[PDB]
Each structure stands twice: as C-alpha cells, then as structure tokens.
Write a protein that binds this DNA or RNA. Sequence first.
DNA 1: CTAAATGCAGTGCATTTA
DNA 2: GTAAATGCACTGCATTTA
Lengths: 78, 72
Amino acid sequence: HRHTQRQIQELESFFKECPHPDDKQRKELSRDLNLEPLQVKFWFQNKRTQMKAQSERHENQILKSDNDKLRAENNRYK
Amino acid sequence: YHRHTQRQIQELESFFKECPHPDDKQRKELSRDLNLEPLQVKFWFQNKRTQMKAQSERHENQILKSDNDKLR
DNA sequence: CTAAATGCAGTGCATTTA
DNA sequence: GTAAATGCACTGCATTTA
C-alpha cells in the first residue's frame, strides 16, 4: 500500500532530472524497478500536485510572516 | 474505483455549508442517512476541508500578489 | 501526504465516409 | 480524385476517493 524506499529514491531521482515522461519513458522505468506503469504514471501526476501544493503552502505560511514582520517595522518608524 | 452518487454529493454540498466540521453523532446520522460508510463520510470532509484552505489561501495568494506588484 | 484513479478538455495522425 | 468526419489513441491537469 506504499512503495519501496529503494524504489522511491529512483523516482525522485528521475523527476529532478526528467519531470515529464513519455509513455516510452514511463515504461522503461517500471521494468527497471518492478512496478506497474499506470502506477508510475499516477505518481508522476501526484508529485506534480505535490510541488504545486507545497510551493504555495510554504509561500503562504512565509509571506504571512514576512508581511507581518515588515508591519511591526513600519509602526516603530511612525 | 467507485465515486459518490449525485444525491450523496448534492446533500454533501448542501450540508457542508451548514457544519463543515461535524462530530461523530451527526457524522453517524449522515453516514446512515446517506447510504455511506462513515469513514468515507469522515474522509470526504477532511479533504473537502483541505481543499478550501488551499483554495482560500490561493486567493489570499493571488490578491496579495497583484496588490504588491501593481504598486511599484 | 499518499496511492490510486476519473473527467474533461485538447492535440496529433491514420483511416472512413460523404 | 479531395475534404470533412470519425475512431483511436495520447497528453495534461485539476479533482475525487481511501
């Protein structure tokens, strides 16, 4: 119900390299690490949602704090 | 797999307006009231919940984004 | 967050049908 | 003979279900 660490390493290793596979690209990976490609297909989409979601989350949790800290500076000036 | 009936989801969208964080008791009736496994019921809300914070902060994002840039 | 999966456009090319 | 259709894949993403 989850994937192998041996496996998942090579997943993330490829996505930094080639974050968008063709079918052909997808198939060969599976044969290398004993998985189904539609699985492989699915993951590659979900990793893409991951980067979208986190790039937003970090930013929001950050800018809220950054726009918060700057405001305190403005009042110390006034 | 198997998605959820429109009857289900419509009642969902209708109730989600009311108590977007519902307790076991009400979860228990709704689960029964709507031919559901309450885990499923418990689940969908968690996601339904999770979606909105993301959707809201994205608008929080885009609105805080255009304001800062346009000033320059 | 994961793992699995669906729904809807849209895109390209090869083959029918009109 | 040609142009428009249709059948078949694939892509890509956002959303849903557990």
